Amino acid sequence: SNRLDGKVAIITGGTLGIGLAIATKFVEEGAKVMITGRHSDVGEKAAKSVGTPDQIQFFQHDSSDEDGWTKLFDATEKAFGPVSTLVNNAGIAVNKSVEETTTAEWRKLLAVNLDGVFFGTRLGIQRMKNKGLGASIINMSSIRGFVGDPSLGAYNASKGAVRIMSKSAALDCALKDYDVRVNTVHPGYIKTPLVDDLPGAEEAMSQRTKTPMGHIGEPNDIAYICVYLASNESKFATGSEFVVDGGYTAQ
Amino acid sequence: SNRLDGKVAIITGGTLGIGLAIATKFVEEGAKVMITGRHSDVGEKAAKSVGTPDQIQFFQHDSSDEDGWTKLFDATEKAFGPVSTLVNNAGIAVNKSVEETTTAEWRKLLAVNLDGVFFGTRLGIQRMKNKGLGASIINMSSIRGFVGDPSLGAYNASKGAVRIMSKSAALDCALKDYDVRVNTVHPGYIKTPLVDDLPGAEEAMSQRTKTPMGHIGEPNDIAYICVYLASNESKFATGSEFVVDGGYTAQ
Amino acid sequence: SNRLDGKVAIITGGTLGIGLAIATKFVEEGAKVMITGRHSDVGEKAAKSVGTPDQIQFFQHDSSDEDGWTKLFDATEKAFGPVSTLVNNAGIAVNKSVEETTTAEWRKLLAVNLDGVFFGTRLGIQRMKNKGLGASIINMSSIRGFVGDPSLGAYNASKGAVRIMSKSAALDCALKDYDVRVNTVHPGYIKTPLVDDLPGAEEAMSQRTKTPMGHIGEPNDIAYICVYLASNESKFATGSEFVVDGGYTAQ
Amino acid sequence: SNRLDGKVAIITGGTLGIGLAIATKFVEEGAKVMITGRHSDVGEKAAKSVGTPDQIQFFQHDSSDEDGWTKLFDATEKAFGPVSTLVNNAGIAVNKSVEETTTAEWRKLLAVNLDGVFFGTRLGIQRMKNKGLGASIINMSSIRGFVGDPSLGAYNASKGAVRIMSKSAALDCALKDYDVRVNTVHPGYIKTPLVDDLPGAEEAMSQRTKTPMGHIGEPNDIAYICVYLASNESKFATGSEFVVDGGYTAQ
Ligand SMILES: NC(=O)c1ccc[n+]([C@@H]2O[C@H](COP(=O)([O-])OP(=O)(O)OC[C@H]3O[C@@H](n4cnc5c(N)ncnc54)[C@H](OP(=O)(O)O)[C@@H]3O)[C@@H](O)[C@H]2O)c1
Ligand SMILES: NC(=O)c1ccc[n+]([C@@H]2O[C@H](COP(=O)([O-])OP(=O)(O)OC[C@H]3O[C@@H](n4cnc5c(N)ncnc54)[C@H](OP(=O)(O)O)[C@@H]3O)[C@@H](O)[C@H]2O)c1
Ligand SMILES: NC(=O)c1ccc[n+]([C@@H]2O[C@H](COP(=O)([O-])OP(=O)(O)OC[C@H]3O[C@@H](n4cnc5c(N)ncnc54)[C@H](OP(=O)(O)O)[C@@H]3O)[C@@H](O)[C@H]2O)c1
Ligand SMILES: NC(=O)c1ccc[n+]([C@@H]2O[C@H](COP(=O)([O-])OP(=O)(O)OC[C@H]3O[C@@H](n4cnc5c(N)ncnc54)[C@H](OP(=O)(O)O)[C@@H]3O)[C@@H](O)[C@H]2O)c1
Ligand SMILES: [Mg+2]
Ligand SMILES: [Mg+2]
Ligand SMILES: [Mg+2]
Ligand SMILES: [Mg+2]
Ligand SMILES: [Mg+2]
Ligand SMILES: [Mg+2]
Known about the structure:
Chains A, B, C, D: This is R-specific alcohol dehydrogenase. Chains A, B, C, D: GO terms for molecular function: metal ion binding; nucleotide binding; oxidoreductase activity. Chains A, B, C, D: Pfam families: adh_short_C2. The structure is a homotetramer. By secondary structure, chain A is α/β, with parallel strands linked by helices. Chain A has one domain: NAD(P)-binding Rossmann-like Domain (Rossmann fold, 3-Layer(aba) Sandwich), CATH 3.40.50.720. Chain A has eight helices and seven strands. A seven-stranded parallel sheet of chain A has the order 3-2-1-4-5-6-7, with helices on both faces. Chain A is globular and about 45 Å long. Chain A starts with 7 loop residues before the first strand and ends in a 7-residue tail after the last strand. The structure holds NADP nicotinamide-adenine-dinucleotide phosphate (4 copies) and magnesium ion (MG) (6 copies). One magnesium ion (MG) sits at the interface of chains B and D.
């Protein structure tokens, strides 16, 4: 009930769905949280639904916006003190095969899913290192960082990139004794607001040829592995992939 | 502080080192625990050091002993009620290359590390399935289930076997709606009693070409990932590998 | 057309199906070959169908028979000179889940698929090392060395074991400059005699949720990757997995 | 000696080192080849060193140049007929950690290593599909598509991206019966011109803690696996990773 005592976390894309569940459990475990999203209506409502401004605040930011990343860390420091924990969770999908992906679609997806995670990881190392915070960078990296989907070409590229870039950062932080860990989390199919707006999506995802458990997960499934990775319980885990997917990748 | 409320766990090789830390944290999170080991002096002392017989007991058992597995589950049921959780942690190593492994060494190691995990996993599914327990089988499966060591030939064989056999069991339990999950845990180098009896072992393991963090882990590092996997927090995780290795396999 | 010039190969389970195709292409690329199998009627016919006794011979041997392995290498040396190449291809399956596998089934499958590959790999290193042969041990290791099948529990165990044991042997041979490489080959579904005797098997295997190419492979698909790995073309490849599966593991 | 009979191949970065060896072996196996590079002095010399214009030509092209990709395929078609084979081999490295990578460095590396491979793969599918060519796209994807290097942050990102994007493309081509395969090749350390210009690089790469064989590979090591993947010998291989690394990733 205080597994994140003293932690100060930034969670990108934290105003709905998976990111909001992470933020909710982080606050319940004692962390101070800054959540981001592009829309202030959603974000301010989300923060107030979780706790007081002494526990959680919202910062408007598109994770592809490099300059905004500096302002986000500045604001979080001023509200809560030194940032210890970063969850790079914001991401988008293009439902196109590699063959049918336009270059504009390619660049837009990579700006959020890859450039954004790079900007956050790079800045996080610079701001977290050598502060004795037990710092942890958690990069959201999908079953699509492991297995292809014929209709998710650019998404697959971005998730494979985050999977292995995170190992580079993990190693550099470990070898330099920075007291920063970097790991990736790989959700299978999760019942999100988006999933609920796509007719038939959940049923298709629950077929046993896709998810062997025969149903999809919920946002708290991803929140709990993120609590583990943000806490000092996982102080020896770095450079590794944590898969929570109902068996999807085991077959 | 009650993340394992109501759980009933068997932990093989639970009387020292990693297994004892798992048992200790399991009891602290509300589980009832039966620990095993071959030696009753060690085992009875270990159980009493953790809690009362209402919380934790010892059962003398070599995990290669197929008939003893039945007696172990029987005893645990009689002490604590239906078993929900099994940690197959007992294991041995032969420090021989494949080239230099005698067949007697091969069969002895496989009897503990592979037959034993098979016996426990098979029996666990039979006894746990369809009871609404949120059941979880946690198979200890090493960095040596991922990367070879020239001087651990039979050990590598056994850990690779446990890694993939566990996925078969995970899938069968998921597809049949048994309410049993099966996952593997892959420690890097951990400061155990054995490590402390080998002069120079810890220093060699801490070299950056081996463990990038520059130091080895502690038994509680493995206990905490086991708490996560035994708890209902991980109810969507099955068929997956959880690596806690200080960066060993990331490079 | 002489990619295996001067090589001397043992291929276990070489009298039908995949093993026979490997032997056929090996002979066509200039290797001398000893094929094994349990039945002399099949084996003598198979050898004569491929070439003369100066090119290929049959040796009756169950790969679980440890003492027979010595006799097999002796016979191959006497026929053809020093063995350079070993393909551990003999294997069996039990169509049982982990839950439903009897211990007799478990031990029988491991005797062929795991003990047998260990016996051949161990002996191969001892006999091949330090002879300047460009020696290569090719261990047949399945898509089931990567992904679980709920009805192939013991098979999954054996293939995971061969996958990682082979890396141990690869590393030891490389670090000791033995001039022996060890790699694994991982077929997807292949149209074998066995497949043709199971009604409906090929159609089930060709479903896109199983093999994305929509059809299964043929024995020559596995023969060609084995030629590459046995030849000096692959002199820098060791400790690695070579997957030929129509896309099975990519999704 | 005619394993690529009738094939028409584009090899990016084909004027030196690994790419030139691929082109050389491709021509020796009967393929017609268009090699690319940025510098015409190098490229025209390279082509003429391998064969006549009826066998091999050079096309000046930076693989980050999207519009040039169309012109490259057009020119290759006019010289040799329909393209069957694409090797995306051009790539660059920044020797910076994630922490120390400037955004300009990030974008420059991704433009070549990731955008370029995407442009070539996308165009290759569009131009190769449904032509009965036995088409094959071979994406060069490094040991750094598997394991991190603390000083290769952007490179790791790009190689992880190519690793998994290639599986998406493989699956789409297989499920749509396009007669196009897509696979990745993962060299370890190879003695290239670049390696020879870095004092001490080869010795560092040959340390057993890096390459267990105790020496690095040569360009023909990568050419031979590319011949296999471009030939119809590998007609059942798609969506998979082919590692040729002297044991680097096995430990
Ligand atoms: N027509 C179709 O076929 C189709 C298919 C799929 C989806 N959709 C549309 O997609 C909508 C949802 O898309 P969404 O991306 O907004 O999903 P979302 O579920 O809102 O995204 C999850 C979280 O990430 C945040 N986020 C998204 N992009 C971000 C960025 N660049 N930087 C930082 N945080 C970011 C979101 O807040 P913010 O959104 O406030 O930034 C939210 O907090 C649906 O409501 C629907 O209209 C349409
Ligand atoms: N001379 C050398 O070079 C060398 C090198 C390494 C180790 N050693 C010896 O190895 C000893 C430790 O070996 P160990 O295997 O007993 O280690 P351990 O550290 O005692 O094993 C960890 C846990 O597993 C249990 N366990 C071990 N084998 C088991 C089995 N078959 N079934 C169930 N539980 C099992 C152990 O209890 P139980 O042990 O009570 O069963 C303990 O609870 C050292 O004290 C030392 O004497 C010698
Ligand atoms: N009733 C059913 O539901 C069912 C289902 C599946 C299969 N089956 C039966 O299985 C038969 C085929 O089984 P099989 O294992 O003989 O397949 P196989 O296709 O003959 O095996 C492939 C190759 O491996 C060899 N081999 C097999 N076991 C070996 C061992 N222990 N050591 C060395 N080489 C070995 C085989 O020769 P040798 O066989 O001569 O040793 C052959 O050269 C079918 O003909 C059918 O009767 C029945
Ligand atoms: N000072 C230092 O510390 C340091 C360190 C490392 C390297 N270097 C410099 O790096 C030079 C080599 O770099 P390099 O990238 O030219 O290596 P390279 O060895 O020439 O590259 C391999 C192949 O890829 C081609 N290629 C490179 N970039 C390409 C692109 N964007 N599109 C298509 N093909 C491409 C190359 O031809 P083209 O090059 O003709 O395009 C060649 O065919 C050295 O000669 C040295 O001057 C300096
Ligand atoms: Mg939104
Ligand atoms: Mg799969
Ligand atoms: Mg002991
Ligand atoms: Mg037979
Ligand atoms: Mg150059
Ligand atoms: Mg490694």
